[PDB]
Write a protein that binds this ligand. Sequence first.
Ligand code: FDE
Ligand SMILES: Cc1cc(Br)ccc1O
Length: 137
Amino acid sequence: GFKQDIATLRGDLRTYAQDIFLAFLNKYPDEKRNFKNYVGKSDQELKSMAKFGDHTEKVFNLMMEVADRATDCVPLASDASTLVQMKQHSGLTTGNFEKLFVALVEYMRASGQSFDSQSWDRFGKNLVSALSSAGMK
Ligand code: FDE
Ligand SMILES: Cc1cc(Br)ccc1O
């Protein structure tokens, strides 16, 4: 289920992070402009860029901690707060997270592994919800 899925992603996290994030950037090409230097790059080009690799891993390093501290796919109120306050991230939006999670659920759906994709779908919704309530627009 959801807990075992955290262990599976964590076990090859750099490749899972890049591949789901690329699935996000390719489903919603308008997202690349939040990472402007990403625009007009192939998947293999992005994967060559230091900050792409490092940043996508840290996104996922963080989202796996929030998934691990969640109960029944509901994150800690405290976790959403910290995220809304995050230095250098004043401009994050909940609509951009819902897009990330759509991409993550389709990825898990299209894989031949027993991911609990309904659970991630729930988690995605519940994280947006907690982000909304913590004051992310
Ligand atoms: C969703 C999400 C999540 C996250 C998380 C995180 C963690 C844990 C950590 C981090 C870090 C970071 N960020 Fe982070 N993140 C994100 C996003 C983002 C964006 C959009 C940006 C912008 C970029 C520019 O260009 O400015 C960022 C951003 C960021 C930064 C700066 C940039 C560079 O160049 O490097 C940093 C350092 N981020 N991060
Ligand atoms: C640009 C952006 C990306 C992600 Br992933 C989440 C939020 C946000 O505003």
